[PDB]
Structures are given as structure tokens and as C-alpha cells.
């Protein structure tokens, strides 16, 4: 694999939509077969298309260096694999509830399906979302 410059174009593409999103969610696949790609990744094409970056670069200094730009509570995610997810279609949409109803959908391990921002807190399955 090439230099740091092509490792920063993934940081540029990640941060390019951080400052405009509303919600952030966490999902993990340490047992994830490509049937999760069949279900979870094609679930992004139901809403908007391709650009829902579900990238996984959550090293202690790889995805943390792109954190101080906006929503600075993502700096200490560290281990327990994190796939970032942003919610552009609709202010305070239901992608966090899309994973909350996916607990019976091949999602035994999802980094405790925590969720990350809006209350600036921890794990709580929210229900006060606009319909």
C-alpha cells in the first residue's frame, strides 16, 4: 500500500460530510460474512445511494486525527470495531432506529450498537425521532 497521502484522501472524504450530518451510529462486524454486505450495505442504497461512508479506520490515531474538526466526542472510540455512519437524508432521521430494529438481523455483535451524537451521551435506544 502507498504513502500517507492516499491515507489522507480517505480522511478528506470522511471529514467532507462530517460537518453537514445530523446523527452518528456505530455498527461492528467481527463475524460479518458478505451476507451482512447483502443486508447492511445494500440498506444504504435504499435511502440515498453509495456515499454513506461506513468506512472502518478506527485506529487510536487514524480516525481520531479527523475527529477534532467536528463532533469531538468520537476521539475515544478506539477498539471494539467502529463503522461510522452519517444521516444526511432528513434532519434527525431513523438510521439509528434502522439498526435498533436490526438486532434480530444478523447483528449479534455491533459494538453494543451504541450510537454517538445528539444527546452527547452513551448507549440509549432513542424513540424521540421525527416520523
Amino acid at each position: 500500500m502507498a504513502l500517507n497521502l492516499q491515507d489522507k484522501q480517505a480522511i478528506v472524504a470522511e471529514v467532507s460530510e462530517v460537518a453537514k450530518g445530523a446523527l452518528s451510529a456505530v455498527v461492528a462486524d467481527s463475524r460479518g460474512v458478505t451476507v451482512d454486505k447483502m443486508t447492511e450495505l445494500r440498506k444504504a442504497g435504499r435511502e440515498a445511494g453509495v456515499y454513506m461512508r461506513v468506512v472502518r479506520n478506527t485506529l487510536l490515531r487514524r480516525a481520531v486525527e479527523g475527529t477534532p474538526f467536528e463532533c469531538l466526542k468520537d476521539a475515544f472510540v478506539g477498539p471494539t470495531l467502529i463503522a461510522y455512519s452519517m444521516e444526511h437524508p432528513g434532519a434527525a432521521a431513523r438510521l439509528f432506529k434502522e439498526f435498533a430494529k436490526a438486532n434480530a438481523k444478523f447483528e449479534v455483535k455491533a459494538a453494543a450498537f451504541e450510537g454517538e451524537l445528539i444527546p452527547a451521551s452513551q448507549i440509549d435506544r432513542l424513540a424521540t425521532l421525527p416520523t
Binding site: 447483502m38 445494500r42 444504504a44 442504497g45 435504499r46 445511494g49 453509495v50
Partner: protein, 141 residues
Amino acid sequence: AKKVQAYVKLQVAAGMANPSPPVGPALGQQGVNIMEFCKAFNAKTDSIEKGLPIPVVITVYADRSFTFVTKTPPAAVLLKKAAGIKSGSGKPNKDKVGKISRAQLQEIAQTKAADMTGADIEAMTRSIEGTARSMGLVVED
């Protein structure tokens, strides 16, 4: 569905039932006979096109009951009935026989997307373009 222990991908040339010369003992290896194979598939022959080489994923269970979900016929034979040519690749780097339009193929590629793993319909028609010129076919535009 379950993890693979006894089920495989089969049904070469579904125009005629029981592909015993082409496929043969592949489903007969684990636990499945050919007599009941046509019984469950008989509700799926005349509901779709007859004479098309459509594959099906034979699903094998441990309780003598077997189910099936038919998939879309490949781009290997869907370009034969669309362009009107009963041929194939042969040598793709030396001859180009097909003259098929992109609009002529995407009108049946929207039927392909009901089983294909895509997001947008037109985002997956370029995948059949990758099989198009692999056989000696040009997509006019």
C-alpha cells in the same frame, strides 16, 4: 438459509427439466434425488420463460425437505436471446458478432435487478457491459 454443508449452485439449461447429462450427480451426491426435483420446480417452469438457461440454487436440508429460490439467468445467455445470436465468446480478442443497444439491454436488466445485489438499476447495467465485450459484442451508444 444456513452455512454451506450440502447445497450447491446448479441447473444448467433449465429449458428442459432434470439436467442429468450436464449436471448429473451433483445434487445426487449429498442427499437429493432427481425425481422430486422436477416436482417442486414444476410451479416455476411455465411461470417464467421456457427454453432459457436459468440456474437455481438447490437448498439441501437435513430433514429430507428441500426448497429453492430461482435466480436470474446469467448474462451469458440473456445476451443471446436479446441480441438474437445463438453464439458466444469463442475467442473474444478476434471477433465481435453482436450488435445490441444499451437501451435494448437495460429494459430487461431492470428485471435482472430484482435478484441482483445492486443499489440503483442503472448502476448495475455497466456490470453487464463488462460481460458484453467479453463475448464479442459491442454496445452502441
